[PDB]
């Protein structure tokens, strides 16, 4: 996706983000996993 | 230069400038505590004269400039030329 004048550039942009956000949602799953497995201690600072 | 010699000697480890001991047992130069260094240099002079007699007993043509009196705490380097006796306190390390 670059300087493509046609809206097909925007459509390929949409495909690019849907695979991009597949990766990004994998990252979200990782960070939420590390979150929950590091939780349960207390509220203060590094805990929550 | 005396000051150059002082700077060169103080560069050695555990050495505070240069102290030189005369034939009287009084150090011509003052770098450490006076009474302790005076008595220590007096005993040094007594020993170095009696060691001079030692060597001339069997070596009547030799001169003394080197002696390594080292303990488990510090080493004293004693060196006479003819009248000026350099004493230097240096760590064994």
């Amino acid at each position: 996706d670059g300087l493509d004048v046609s809206k097909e550039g925007t459509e390929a942009w949409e495909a690019a983000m849907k695979r991009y956000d597949e990766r990004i949602d994998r990252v979200e799953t990782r960070i939420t996993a590390r979150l929950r497995d590091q939780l349960g201690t207390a509220k203060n600072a590094n805990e929550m | 230069e005396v000051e150059e010699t002082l700077k060169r000697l103080q560069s050695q480890k555990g050495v505070q400038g240069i102290i030189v001991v005369n034939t009287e047992g009084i150090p011509i130069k003052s770098t450490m505590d006076n009474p302790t260094t005076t008595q220590y240099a007096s005993l040094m002079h007594s020993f170095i004269l009696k060691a001079r007699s030692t060597v001339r007993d069997i070596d009547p043509q030799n001169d003394l400039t080197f002696l390594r009196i080292r303990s488990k705490k510090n080493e004293i380097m004693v060196a006479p030329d003819k009248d000026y006796f350099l004493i230097v306190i240096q760590n064994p390390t």
Binding site: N44, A45 | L9, K13, I28, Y84, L86, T93
Partner: protein
């Protein structure tokens, strides 16, 4: 013979042989070879003078880094027992009794060593008199005592410190009323200088802590009981409070300037320990609190910068937990943190002038001398640049 002909004989020019001899022996003697974490380090707890009587102030002797001054204030167990007691603790050898004991008629509230006299102890009391202790004297009674006049302090004195060079000294003391006073160390019968710390016209300051930046004696920082830190100029046309700080909504229970040197300056930085468990890494030039470390339900009592680490600083807790915070390592969780037994409300922390050993006070009188890990104690050359970058972060 005498010390006059030696000078001329040195000035004589027969020293070529001696110089060659010295050069040879030194150049031949140049070669040298060989012939062949947080821990409870030590304790201190008197029993005759340390029954209850919580710790109130701590210090180390600059001349004798093995010496610590204690200050046990409260007297409620027995009215007949001594009211104020200051104990001195030595590091070179382990004993069960304090080396030297000092008794004052009022309750001693702060204390420190004397810089000019390395054989003298000066401490503040609850009545407001600056109290001397000539250690040469064999009597527990104070040797020299400041009058309780309007010229001198009349309110509980909590901060005392002697500053200056060996040939020019001044004992500064600040009381809760705010009257700063400099005395001469040798003469305390009269206040050689003093003035009352006032903010904007007709507004007294409830001083409860201070710290002088390293080197400076003209300007310093003060922590008030009203939670608003200030900076004051000791001598000058603008002598008095020169800065208003928003600070924290709780009383300031401790303060300290930066205590390191060698790289880019950090004397502008200092930490205040508030009454709501909020220590504040924060600089003089700015007015907004740089960071606001917060945790716990209870609250801090003292904070001390490391004398060698440009980032590390300690942190008292009333829950008995001593925690060291290393900003370069982290900014959210205590870098080190351990709780002393019996969960008593600790009241002070003082770092050894070496910076390698830390002290903590106690709510029952048992001063605990804690040791720190080698990696956590000594900083590196890159440590200062890392601290600069972390400050530049926000």
């Amino acid at each position: 013979l005498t010390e006059e002909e030696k000078q001329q004989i040195l000035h004589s020019e027969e020293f070529l042989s001696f110089f060659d001899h010295s050069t040879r022996i030194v150049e031949r003697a140049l070669s040298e070879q060989i012939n062949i974490k947080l821990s409870l380090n030590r304790q201190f707890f008197d029993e005759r003078w340390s029954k209850h009587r919580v710790v109130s102030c701590l210090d180390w002797s600059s001349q004798y880094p093995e010496l610590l001054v204690a200050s046990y204030n409260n007297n409620e167990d027995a009215p007949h027992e001594p009211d104020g007691v200051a104990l001195v603790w030595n590091m070179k050898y382990k004993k069960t009794t304090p080396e030297y004991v000092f008794h004052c008629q009022s309750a001693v509230m702060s204390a420190t060593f004397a810089k000019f006299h390395p054989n003298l102890v000066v401490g503040g009391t609850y009545s407001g008199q600056i109290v001397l202790w000539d250690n040469r004297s064999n009597k527990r009674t104070p040797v020299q005592r400041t009058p309780l006049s309007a010229a001198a302090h009349t309110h509980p004195v909590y901060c005392v410190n002697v500053v200056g060079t060996q040939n020019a000294h001044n004992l500064i003391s600040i009381s809760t009323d705010g009257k700063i006073c400099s005395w001469s160390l040798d003469m305390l019968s009269h206040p050689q200088d003093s003035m009352e710390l006032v903010h904007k016209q007709s507004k007294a300051v409830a001083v409860t802590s201070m710290s002088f930046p390293v080197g400076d004696v003209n300007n310093f920082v003060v922590g008030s009981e009203e939670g608003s830190v200030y900076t004051a100029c000791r001598h000058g046309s603008k002598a008095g409070i020169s800065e208003m700080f928003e600070g924290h909504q709780g009383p300031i229970t401790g303060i300290h300037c930066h205590a390191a040197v060698g790289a880019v300056d950090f004397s502008h930085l200092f930490v205040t320990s508030s009454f709501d468990w909020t220590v504040k890494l924060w600089t003089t030039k700015n007015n907004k609190p740089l960071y606001s470390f917060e945790d716990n339900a209870d609250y801090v009592y003292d904070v001390m910068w490391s004398p060698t680490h440009p980032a590390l600083f300690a942190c008292v807790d009333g829950m008995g937990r001593l925690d060291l915070w290393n900003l370069n390592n982290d900014t959210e969780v205590p870098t080190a943190s351990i709780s002393v037994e019996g969960n008593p409300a600790l009241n002070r922390v003082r770092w050894t002038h070496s910076g390698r050993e830390i002290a903590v006070g106690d709510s029952e009188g048992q001063i605990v001398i804690y040791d720190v890990g080698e990696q956590i104690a000594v900083p590196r050359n890159d440590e200062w640049a890392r601290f600069g970058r972390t400050l530049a972060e926000i």
